[PDB]
Ligand binder design. Structure first.
Ligand SMILES: Cc1cc(-c2ccccc2)[nH]n1
Ligand SMILES: Cc1cc(-c2ccccc2)[nH]n1
Lengths: 285, 285
């Protein structure tokens, strides 16, 4: 077999596997439960992003160990992955979909505002805070995430194009819509949550999965969707748009009539203050 | 005014400006002339590329100083920039064009073979070895150059595209033709050398420089080009192709009938052994 590093061991009492390998552990100082993600020897860039982000719907780094393997100490999410709530045609309640999606939009909006594109949004990277259906969700796994920074295209455009290739000038029209990939993913997530099935699949189809996606022709099953509201499906349709320039942004999605739900918003604010009740320092007044 | 760093000063006797600021200097050890490029405080990446490249038509780093400014010690090219031979409608002899272009193709072929895209090829970055028209040329300024490495697209394609945005699947067709930007630039260079004028310009034209380039509709002046061979112009036409997938590669260009010139090839081999006569260590036999 093999051992954990002395420095990890010094600080945490390592326990059972949760689900990259993720294990349960206990901070010795606090006796509190943590999740430790092991990555066998991009991880530095992931730590750099996660250290600077600060949102209740984005996972927080608690510690990091650069040993024979990387060890990332994260906050423990007792509800597990959202994937385990959607597998085997399991259909989430329309209201539960909204509460979770609203949080995913808030998290992805924060990311975009801060110049971060996740690039790998799926149910397996959306964690639930408790075994309760009305709970806080957090976006995890920033391993494939990208930083928007300062484009080499903006620098190239400052010059004279005497020697500039045409394809570079053609890319100017689309440039800066990479974040739209995160809205596609959210749309595929919302579809799976609402219906219990994926929009693009090789199951009972002749058309290749690639052709389905490029044509943006999702598998629509009327019997399944008759249970879902017209508003929920309208948002799906608006995110599953092929043109990344026309596709709905996180701001447009958050403005959609489906998310204009004062009850759902109240429940989220309530879950937030319930979580925050622990951190609560006395107020000035 | 201001001073040079003690470490630079220790090794070189700094002299007159040559032309980023480039100054003449003398290595104290050898009493030999060098060119020192000063960059005021990407430069590390430029040094990393230039340290690993090894071709007679690519400039070599001799030293580097990371001071209040960057100081890059390069080999001195007495012929200066090719730009100074093409300004003010100055037309290079068809044979001189070939000798220089053949070397530019050999240099750019080496770059591509080694996973480097220059991204800023122009007459001002092509240096001449002597004041003689039959001379060795060297490609300089790797400041905007890029490394091909390991694409995130190849990593993304290893997964299932259930959640993958359509535009990512659409980019798969063009992916890996970025090097073709270097062949466009060479084509714009060859045109300027042969004709004395640029193919795409705002001078005596209604059509925007952008529109000219995307349509690939170069300004063709028959009287000017009647002096130039049909073969020379055929190669230009093959490099000034809008589709980066159809555009001529450095290998295709080097195979073109215009470069199938045994005389031109002989003269280059002769200039090479003339340069190499100094470095010459005794042979084993
Ligand atoms: C980063 C992380 C992973 C987890 C987790 C907890 C239980 C089951 C599955 C996953 N919490 N936090
Ligand atoms: C890198 C470099 C620059 C030069 C140079 C020499 C004379 C005139 C203009 C430029 N040689 N090498």
């Amino acid at each position: 077999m093999s051992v954990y590093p002395k420095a990890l061991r010094d600080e945490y009492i390592m326990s059972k596997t949760l689900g990259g390998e993720v294990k349960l552990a206990f901070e010795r100082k606090t006796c509190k439960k943590v999740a430790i993600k092991i990555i066998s020897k991009n991880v530095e860039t992931e730590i750099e992003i996660l250290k600077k982000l600060n949102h209740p719907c984005i996972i927080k780094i608690k510690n990091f160990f650069d040993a024979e393997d990387y060890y990332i100490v994260l906050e423990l999410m007792e509800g597990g992955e959202l994937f385990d709530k959607v597998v085997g045609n399991k259909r989430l309640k329309e209201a539960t979909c909204k509460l979770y999606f609203y949080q995913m939009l808030l998290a992805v909006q924060y990311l975009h505002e801060n110049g971060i594109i996740h690039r790998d949004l799926k149910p397996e990277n959306v964690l639930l805070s408790s075994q309760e259906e009305d709970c806080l969700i957090k976006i995890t796994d920033f391993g494939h995430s990208k930083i928007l920074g300062e484009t080499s295209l903006m620098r190239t455009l400052c010059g004279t194009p005497t020697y500039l290739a045409p394809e570079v000038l053609v890319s100017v029209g689309t440039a800066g819509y990479n974040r739209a990939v995160d809205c596609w993913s959210l749309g595929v997530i919302l579809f799976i949550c609402l219906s219990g099935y994926p929009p693009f699949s090789e199951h009972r189809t002749q058309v290749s999965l690639k052709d389905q996606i490029t044509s943006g022709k999702y598998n629509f099953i009327p019997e399944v969707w008759a249970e879902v509201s017209e508003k929920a499906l309208d948002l799906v349709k608006k995110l599953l748009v092929v043109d990344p320039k026309a596709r709905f942004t996180t701001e447009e999605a958050l403005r959609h009539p489906w998310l204009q739900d004062e009850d759902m918003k109240r429940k989220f604010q309530d879950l937030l203050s319930e979580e925050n009740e622990s951190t609560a320092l006395p107020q000035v007044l």
